Amino acid sequence: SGPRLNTDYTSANQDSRVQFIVLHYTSTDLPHSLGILTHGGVSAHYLIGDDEPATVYRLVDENRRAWHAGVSEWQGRTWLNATSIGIEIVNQGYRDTPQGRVWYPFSEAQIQALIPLLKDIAKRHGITPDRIIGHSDIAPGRKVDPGPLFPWKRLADAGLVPWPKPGELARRLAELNGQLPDVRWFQQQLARHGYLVPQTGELEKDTRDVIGAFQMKYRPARFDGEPDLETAALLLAVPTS
Amino acid sequence: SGPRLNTDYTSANQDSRVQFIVLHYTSTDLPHSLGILTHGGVSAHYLIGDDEPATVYRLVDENRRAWHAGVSEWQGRTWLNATSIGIEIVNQGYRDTPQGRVWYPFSEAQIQALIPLLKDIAKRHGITPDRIIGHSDIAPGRKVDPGPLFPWKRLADAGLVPWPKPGELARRLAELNGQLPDVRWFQQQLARHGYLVPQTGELEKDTRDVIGAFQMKYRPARFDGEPDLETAALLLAVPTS
Numbered sequence: 303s304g305p306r307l308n309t310d311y312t313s314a315n316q317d318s319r320v321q322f323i324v325l326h327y328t329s330t331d332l333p334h335s336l337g338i339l340t341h342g343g344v345s346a347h348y349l350i351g352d353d354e355p356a357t358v359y360r361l362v363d364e365n366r367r368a369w370h371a372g373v374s375e376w377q378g379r380t381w382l383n384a385t386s387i388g389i390e391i392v393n394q395g396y397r398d399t400p401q402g403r404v405w406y407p408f409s410e411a412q413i414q415a416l417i418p419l420l421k422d423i424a425k426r427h428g429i430t431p432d433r434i435i436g437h438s439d440i441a442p443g444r445k446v447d448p449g450p451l452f453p454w455k456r457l458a459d460a461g462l463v464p465w466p467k468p469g470e471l472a473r474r475l476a477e478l479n480g481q482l483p484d485v486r487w488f489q490q491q492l493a494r495h496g497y498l499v500p501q502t503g504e505l506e507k508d509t510r511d512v513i514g515a516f517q518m519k520y521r522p523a524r525f526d527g528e529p530d531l532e533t534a535a536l537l538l539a540v541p542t543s
Numbered sequence: 544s545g546p547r548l549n550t551d552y553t554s555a556n557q558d559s560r561v562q563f564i565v566l567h568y569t570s571t572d573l574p575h576s577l578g579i580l581t582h583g584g585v586s587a588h589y590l591i592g593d594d595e596p597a598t599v600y601r602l603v604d605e606n607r608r609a610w611h612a613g614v615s616e617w618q619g620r621t622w623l624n625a626t627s628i629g630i631e632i633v634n635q636g637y638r639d640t641p642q643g644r645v646w647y648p649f650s651e652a653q654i655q656a657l658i659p660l661l662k663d664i665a666k667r668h669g670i671t672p673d674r675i676i677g678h679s680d681i682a683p684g685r686k687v688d689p690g691p692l693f694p695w696k697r698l699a700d701a702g703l704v705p706w707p708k709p710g711e712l713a714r715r716l717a718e719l720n721g722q723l724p725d726v727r728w729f730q731q732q733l734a735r736h737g738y739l740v741p742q743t744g745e746l747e748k749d750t751r752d753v754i755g756a757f758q759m760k761y762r763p764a765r766f767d768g769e770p771d772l773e774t775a776a777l778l779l780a781v782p783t784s
């Protein structure tokens with residue numbers, strides 16, 4: 303097109319533009335999700351339906367930019383849309399009780415659809431486990447999906463995401479000696495894991511949101527964002543894979 | 544067990560992964576540039592030769608990631624490789640002589656090859672003028688290409704990069720009244736233009752590198768990074784997108 307172009311040669315120094323995979327849930331049923339993701343203000347490359355077997359919809363090819371992430375950061379990479387593949391999952395989200403928050407679990411059909419997909423996408427694009435991540439991770443104070451009911455442990459089992467090895471955990475809390483590290487330490491470990499986090503040494507929402515997000519992934523029994531001893535053990539036992 | 548893909552539906556809410564175009568020079572001749580950019584561990588999507596007419600080489604599809612930018616930021620977007628198209632130009636960069644530093648000018652053949660290319664790339668990817676930028680911009684003080692001899696004015700004339708209108712400068716100097724703004728102000732205007740810059744009121748190399756980079760683009764007669772009145776006029780007269 304236009305001036306004298308030469309296409310004889312091809313660089314060996316070549317790569318995928320896609321570095322991350324961001325997991326989501328839709329907060330809507332399958333019919334509404336299709337509309338929103340095709341003609342809403344938002345989009346994802348894939349949409350995993352509810353049925354058995356769970357049907358996966360390619361709505362945007364992995365070559366173009368889907369609008370799923372918004373304002374985002376992971377491992378210092380900002381605005382992840384352009385550098386990522388978004389995967390939405392039809393799931394109803396959460397509800398509020400007076401004693402905290404409850405969530406709809408994911409159908410098993412959708413999980414067994416999700417794993418093969420992630421393996422295939424990760425292989426083609428050479429994406430590592432530490433870059434297959436949730437929306438709650440890339441925007442901790444703003445997002446919370448796919449939530450504490452996402453079976454990361456299953457993805458870990460398929461080798462798709464980081465997870466501590468047996469008794470790595472138990473060894474790490476043995477090292478801590480019962481002494482809880484200070485906020486600044488937690489902030490260091492979180493940034494090291496890839497999270498955007500304040501380095502102040504203070505525990506404001508911003509720092510609490512981020513610790514809360516990490517807890518949701520690896521210790522969803524509680525994720526109030528309150529510095530715990532177990533959380534510290536995870537911050538050391540969890541791989542950077 | 545497993546999924547199956549449905550591609551019946553396709554989202555209207557998608558665009559290009561490529562948001563920026565980064566300009567470079569090679570600091571070496573055409574034969575060596577071809578080797579380096581195809582088998583050197585640095586790459587660019589395009590290479591504009593020094594022949595006449597200038598031959599443009601596609602070495603990496605605009606679909607894949609070329610390794611040209613490295614550690615980078617523009618308008619808060621970090622690590623630009625994955626989100627950008629790199630264009631190298633055969634040009635010896637600079638040389639360090641007994642009579643100062645000398646920069647090699649660009650052949651006019653390569654400029655007339657460059658413009659059509661940039662128009663074509665910008666059209667297909669919907670990239671705005673403020674996102675067609677030099678390497679010196681995305682890493683001030685670490686990088687300095689394509690240098691003060693790059694005719695941004697010509698690109699401005701083709702509508703490819705931001706540039707002040709005929710009466711704009713002169714009107715901006717008139718507003719300034721001869722009173723030079725403080726470092727903090729310059730730092731505010733630079734960050735506003737997309738540069739990674741300190742906000743600390745200090746005039747260290749870090750802040751000086753960035754103002755120097757801006758001077759190189761819009762006022763290359765001098766780019767010491769020293770706050771100018773003329774520079775301030777540019778920081779106001781120059782379009783921001």
Ligand SMILES: CO[C@@H]1O[C@H](CO)[C@@H](O[C@@H]2O[C@H](CO)[C@@H](O[C@@H]3O[C@H](CO)[C@@H](O[C@@H]4O[C@H](CO)[C@@H](O)[C@H](O)[C@H]4NC(C)=O)[C@H](O[C@H](C)C(=O)O)[C@H]3NC(C)=O)[C@H](O)[C@H]2NC(C)=O)[C@H](O[C@H](C)C(=O)O)[C@H]1NC(C)=O
Pocket residue numbers: 326327328329330344395396403442443444445446447510511512514515525526527
């Ligand atoms: C228009 O499209 C839809 O809207 C949004 C996109 O524009 C988007 O909604 C966003 O949804 C998320 C989760 O669904 C929601 O999350 C809340 O944000 C903060 C940060 O997590 C929470 O703060 C927690 O506070 C408590 C108490 O201290 C702690 O226990 C916890 O540690 C804190 N932080 C954590 C966990 O990280 C907040 O809880 C507050 C306190 C509250 O309930 O009052 C979060 N909720 C939960 C359940 O924890 C967020 O507010 C919301 N806002 C945005 C993005 O700005 C929808 O999501 C996607 C795109 C999708 O589902 O497709 C959009 N789409 C749909 C279909 O709804």
Ligand SMILES: [Zn+2]
Pocket residue numbers: 325326327370437445447
């Ligand atoms: Zn989401």
Ligand SMILES: [Zn+2]
Pocket residue numbers: 567568611678686688
């Ligand atoms: Zn360069």
